Amino acid sequence: ATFEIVNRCSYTVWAAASKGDAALDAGGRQLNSGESWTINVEPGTNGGKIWARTDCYFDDSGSGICKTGDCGGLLRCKRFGRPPTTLAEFSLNQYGKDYIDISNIKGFNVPMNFSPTTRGCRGVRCAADIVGQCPAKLKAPGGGCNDACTVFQTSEYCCTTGKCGPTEYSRFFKRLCPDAFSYVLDKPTTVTCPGSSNYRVTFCPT
């Protein structure tokens, strides 16, 4: 499957792609404003994610830091990134179908559209100014808008009992972005696409 990752932001982002225990394709790449990166993701990939990282510094060997979404200090991510991170999430060729969503469960850093480039399903988008509107207690000093689990580490915000409800914080993410997961047990906003669809993730779509 082909994913075109496009940076429409006015600022540089360092794209990342991982399934948590391994890189997808090269795992990460710097994208200046307007740059695109086409990656290939193996069919059957389960639990893949793509995200943006901001304000990164890397040395010649690809080691360094990012202010949002840092993945163990690597340019070429092999694991998931440090919140806050708006997440494009996908599982491919799962009983003949693909499943896509955007999630704010790990906070929000950069606005995103995640759309098929092939027929048979719709895209999802979270492009509201969540960082600008972020509740004071969720603001990350390193940049971005933290989820409440990251901030407070409670069973209710983290849904670690499998019994949690919406919260004042999850409702903020949901109000700004109805089409993205706002907490672990949110009513799903997952889209079902034909198996072996192709996609585009656009940072700062609007």
Q: Which domains does the chain have, with CATH numbers?
A: 1-206 (2.60.110.10)
Where does the chain show beta strands of DSSP type E?
Answer: 2-7, 13-18, 23-31, 36-40, 48-53, 57-58, 64-65, 87-94, 97-103, 112-116, 124-126, 191-194, 199-203
Q: Mention every residue, 6+ apart, whose C-beta is less than 8 A from residue 168.
A: none
Contact in structure between 8 and 34 (CB atoms under 8 Å): yes
Structure token pair of residue 70: 């840092």
The Cβ of residue 92 has, within 10 Å, a number of other Cβ atoms equal to: 21
* Angstrom distance (rounded) from CA 95 to CA 136: 43
* Angstrom distance (rounded) from CA 119 to CA 8: 23
CA angle 123, 18, 99 (to 5 degrees): 30
Å resolution of this model?
Answer: 1.6
Structure determination technique employed: X-ray
